[PDB]
């Protein structure tokens with residue numbers, strides 16, 4: 001029942017995408033590692049509740065690696081939002097609910113603010129607003145050093161579930177290993193300053209639902225909680241840390257379904 | 269230069285207390301374990317900056333165990349605030365800066381709201397507003413099982429620094445061993461519903477500075493961040509988790525001194 005295919009957009013990207021289901025559109029934007037197999041279980045669970053679910057690998061990452069250098073260097077939320085709109089145009093997805101974590105969170109907030117006619121509602125998770133020198137400094141290391149360091153960071157610091165993270169399996173981890181240097185050189189120095197949360201009044205009254213991982217250390221996304229509360233944006237928790245779609249796929253799928261259903265009711 | 273002594277208040281409590289220094293009064297209220305030796309390093313560092321620092325074991329706990337049963341059963345923030353005001357009266361402390369963590373945080377907010385003429389400013393850390401069935405349920409266990417469970421929780425889950433926690437020493441841990449069952453039977457079922465946070469407008473404009481541990485899991489005091497933000501109260505982080513005065517005594521002492529100095533400037 002799942003489409004697994006490629007589609008090229010006029011900006012030069014050849015995307016790998018997956019799609020399952022019929023009904024209102026839900027789009028699952030990856031985190032910075034750009035790997036959509038992390039959504040595999042949840043895509044089926046969400047689609048089974050009466051939705052068309054689309055996901056894709058991000059430009060320069062995994063099976064979307066055929067893309068111009070501009071799309072994976074000096075990456076900002078606004079650049080990513082432009083690219084996501086390009087694939088939604090190519091797939092004739094006019095109105096979408098969107099999810100994203102980390103750089104994907106920045107992307108979906110930029111999508112909602114910049115393309116209000118295209119986005120029904122956005123779910124943002126763990127939106128990075130601060131530069132972290134220990135991550136930025138990986139960009140000048142050799143590729144294999146980057147991959148070794150960031151594979152360890154993902155498993156031990158932010159996966160939210162080491163067994164589930166490892167159970168993604170060798171094929172996924174081999175694609176992540178190749179993505180780490182692309183992410184390191186393109187994302188950590190330029191994503192946080194691009195965060196679309198400087199203007200709290202621009203967030204007020206928008207169809208935005210914000211989450212942070214329940215187990216994430218308080219210091220990581222303290223600023224998200226403050227910002228969301230100042231803007232009156234609905235803010236809450238999901239189990240685990242940065243990858244609830246990996247660590248807790250059934251809870252993640254339920255959250256996406258219930259939040260989409262809440263906005264379909266409010267839309268009427 | 270440390271005074272270590274006792275004082276009896278007409279509510280029936282014989283307090284063990286310590287005092288060091290000369291200057292404006294700073295009072296360090298313990299967390300629910302009621303053990304003021306946890307402040308030993310910080311008391312000297314704060315006092316050295318030109319303050320009179322007072323701390324004490326809490327009623328029923330450690331060396332303040334000569335107290336009526338009503339002071340260590342069915343404990344609320346409002347009962348604890350009344351007890352702290354009784355020792356401040358006995359020591360002729362008319363105007364005080366106060367610190368407290370956990371039940372101590374509920375106590376110092378209740379102090380600031382209930383006794384505004386007595387409290388220059390309050391620092392609250394990790395204020396418990398939710399009932400936790402796994403803690404409430406320890407109250408029906410045998411004393412030795414309560415002590416084994418809670419000693420493990422403090423050391424391995426929430427110390428913010430296991431080496432520093434162990435280095436409190438054998439005599440402190442022997443006192444804590446006896447306090448665990450008193451705390452379990454008197455605190456977790458009644459402290460959270462007593463939280464002086466139901467009226468957000470009552471906190472607005474008050475000289476309150478709120479913190480959460482940077483390493484504490486987000487879910488534990490997410491609600492504190494939301495409430496402080498809604499009230500416009502200054503909210504930030506200390507290193508560690510529930511016991512910054514044990515895990516990071518110098519950082520804790522600098523925070524207490526700088527916060528006190530900020531309110532002495534605002535006062536004038």
Ligand SMILES: C[C@H]1CCC[C@H](O)CCC/C=C/c2cc(O)cc(O)c2C(=O)O1
Pocket residue numbers: 031032033101102103104126128130135158187188189191192220241242
């Ligand atoms: C893979 C994902 C993990 C997030 C973990 C946690 O949510 C955040 C801690 C690690 C930070 C990751 C990050 C930083 C940044 O500046 C830009 C980014 O795209 C990311 C990112 O996408 O990190």
Ligand SMILES: C[C@H]1CCC[C@H](O)CCC/C=C/c2cc(O)cc(O)c2C(=O)O1
Pocket residue numbers: 299300301369370371372394396403426455456457459460488509510
């Ligand atoms: C000992 C201290 C540890 C705080 C750990 C963390 O700050 C909070 C997790 C454990 C809960 C603490 C707690 C709950 C409560 O209902 C009443 C209390 O007096 C406390 C309390 O003082 O906890």
Ligand SMILES: [K+]
Pocket residue numbers: 247248249250251252
């Ligand atoms: K699950």
Ligand SMILES: [K+]
Pocket residue numbers: 515516517518519520
């Ligand atoms: K320290």
